[PDB]
Amino acid sequence: MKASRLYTLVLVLQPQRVLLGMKKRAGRWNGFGGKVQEGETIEDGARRELQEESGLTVDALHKVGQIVFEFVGEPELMDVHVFCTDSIQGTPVESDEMRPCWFQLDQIPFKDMWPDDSYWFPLLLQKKKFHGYFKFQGQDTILDYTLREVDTV
Ligand SMILES: Nc1[nH]c(=O)nc2c1ncn2[C@H]1C[C@H](O)[C@@H](COP(=O)(O)OP(=O)(O)OP(=O)(O)O)O1
Numbered sequence: 436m437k438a439s440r441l442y443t444l445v446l447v448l449q450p451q452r453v454l455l456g457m458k459k460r461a462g463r464w465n466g467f468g469g470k471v472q473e474g475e476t477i478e479d480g481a482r483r484e485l486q487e488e489s490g491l492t493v494d495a496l497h498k499v500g501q502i503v504f505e506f507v508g509e510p511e512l513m514d515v516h517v518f519c520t521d522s523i524q525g526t527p528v529e530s531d532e533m534r535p536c537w538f539q540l541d542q543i544p545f546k547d548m549w550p551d552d553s554y555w556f557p558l559l560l561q562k563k564k565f566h567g568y569f570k571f572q573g574q575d576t577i578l579d580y581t582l583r584e585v586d587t588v
């Protein structure tokens with residue numbers, strides 16, 4: 436088995452809309468997140484990345500899933516811990532690398548999201564927790580994947 440590097444992903448999910456960020460420098464909408472750093476808990480890394488990437492603060496997050504990504508030709512797995520929150524402080528801010536935008540929950544922009552999101556984001560919307568794994572060739576093609584609803588993440 437490959438080694439894995441820890442990442443976070445945060446979805447700001449309100450009753451009628453979700454906040455996503457478009458990668459500016461590519462072209463896909465995603466939640467907010469990045470690499471966990473030395474000495475911080477995963478949840479604190481998720482809060483930090485949300486603040487660094489979007490400007491938003493939150494005192495707490497709910498863990499909703501974990502997804503492992505494998506890319507053909509890359510030596511490490513990405514171990515992505517997925518969090519949600521419904522409660523925000525501040526306005527999202529555009530940066531040189533990210534443009535935030537709200538989407539109504541009948542307009543989730545799946546075609547401009549990573550392909551895996553079509554599989555797990557419906558579970559998130561149903562208040563379900565999940566574990567996933569996806570093996571990609573490049574940015575567009577899934578060669579293998581597993582997904583399971585779990586009671587505890
Ligand atoms: N297939 C996929 N589907 C998805 O929904 N999110 C993915 C994904 N693959 C990666 N992600 C998420 C995980 C993480 O939040 C983000 C990728 O992290 P980044 O590359 O932004 O890390 P960092 O920006 O911290 O690294 P540096 O650029 O070195 O600072 O995208």
Ligand code: NA
Pocket residue numbers: 467468469470488
């Ligand atoms: Na990031």
